[PDB]
Amino acid sequence: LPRRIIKETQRLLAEPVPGIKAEPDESNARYFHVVIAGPQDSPFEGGTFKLELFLPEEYPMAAPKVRFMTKIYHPNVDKLGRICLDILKDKWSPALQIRTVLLSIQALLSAPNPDDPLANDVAEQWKTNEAQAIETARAWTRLYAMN
Amino acid sequence: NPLVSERLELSVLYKEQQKIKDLHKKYSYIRKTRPDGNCFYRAFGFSHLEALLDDSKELQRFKAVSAKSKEDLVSQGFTEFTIEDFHNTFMDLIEQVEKQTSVADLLASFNDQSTSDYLVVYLRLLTSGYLQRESKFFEHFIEGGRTVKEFCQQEVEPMCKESDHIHIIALAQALSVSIQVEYMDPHIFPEGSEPKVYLLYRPGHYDILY
Amino acid sequence: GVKVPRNFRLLEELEEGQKGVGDGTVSWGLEDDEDMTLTRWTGMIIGPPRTNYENRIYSLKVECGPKYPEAPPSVRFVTKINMNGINNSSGMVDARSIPVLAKWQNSYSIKVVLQELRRLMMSKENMKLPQPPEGQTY
Secondary structure, eight states, X not given: OOHHHHHHHHHHHHSOOTXXXXXXXXXXXXXXXXXXXXXXXXXXXXXEEEEEEEOOTTTTSSOOEEEESSOOOOTTBOTTOBBOOGGGTTTOOTTOOHHHHXXXXXXXXXXXXXXXXXXXXHHHHHHSOHHHHHHHHHHHHHHHSOO | OOSBOOOEEGGGGGGOXXXXXXXXXXXXXXXXXXXXXXXXXXXXXXXXXXXXTTOHHHHHHHHHHHHHHHHHHHTTTOOHHHHHHHHHHHHHHHHHHHSOOOHHHHHHHHSSHHHHHHHHHHHHHHHHHHHHHTHHHHGGGXXXXXXXXXXXXXXXXXXXXXXXXXXXXXXXXXXXXXXXEEEOOOEEESSSSOOSEEEEEETTEEEEEO | OOOOOHHHHHHHHXXXXXXXXXXXXXXOOBSOXXXXXXXXXXXXXXXOTTSTTTTOEEEXXXXXXXXXXXXXXXXXXXXXXXXXXXXTTTOBBOSSSSHHHHTOOTTOOHHHHHHHHHHHTSSTTTTTOOOOOTTOBO
């Protein structure tokens, strides 16, 4: 384990982002059980969404791995929970930390795309039938995020 | 293919034409680096540390800036326990030049992925740190309506991201080390100052000249 | 060395399963692509030549427990087969009699498991065994 990883865990626990619980697994210090409350005023309000974070072999050279455990209707999230986000592939610098990724995901939930639209079936639905999309997300928050 | 290569001859560029003839009458030796988009930071990083094995004056002057560099970025808003490990790698290379080491012993440490990349990161951080300090100045040198901070989050800080004049001007003025770039298509960065580091730019590559 | 979690491993397995390995005589993929739990997988083995299995498509089901890949998956044939280690009623694969499941390392993948079964069909005590009629399930 790098000093980077042990210090990041301690700072992440020392100063929590409001609306995000993130406990490392005692068995695998590279794995993090992340829970996010659906931002107030969003289509996800009242829902609680499970995510998982993994710090790969290469960390902090390679970006962290993040995925939704909870089913969610969102442009940046796919049918298996894989998050399309710049700072998780192309635009990740070794200088960036976990809590950046973490609340970056939270910002996504707060106000779903597009500032530059990504091309998928969900995002296309938001780009035209937005009011319909928001009601879909509200419904999916009910049956997946609310127990 | 190595990360940083041997001190190869300048006649090897005819294997890849009258523009090299002009380059020969002012240069004699080339040093190749892996064309992985991290060229500039690895090339300058070796060019300047290799030149410091002859120059004790610039060595201790360089060490003073580099040490003070860490606290500079922290005063600028970089979380300290982030850059600590890349600074520790950077200072450990300055300490390895201070202790008189061979050019071949230095090269073997630059071809170590971990040690080399960790340095490239800190050189990128140094570039990105200085661009954000002189944010007001560089604002209109960026295209696409990208802000200086955004340009830094997208083209400067992340690995495997190509360098142009904005990166070169930036790192040069941060460490106060002049650079001259020769374009396989001459420019001094910054303007007027005597060049310490000679480089050759081909589309996608940066090379150390001598 | 460094432990990789269940889900981040299984997504890689899926990716490789989508791109396809070798020729295609072994392939896998999720039973349901909207299943966020990543538990049920569909395996597919083309029988190895010069054996009584040759040129038969064998569909399998593979299940990954909450502890994969620290402990092996449970594997089961859908297509009927006559093979040492495979139950005649269910098509379940006995974990003891398969050298990859009995001697399970965490580095093994659903790929490795499917090839290991395809290799054991070439074994001397299997290659000549009389087979059931083709295209028949349990």
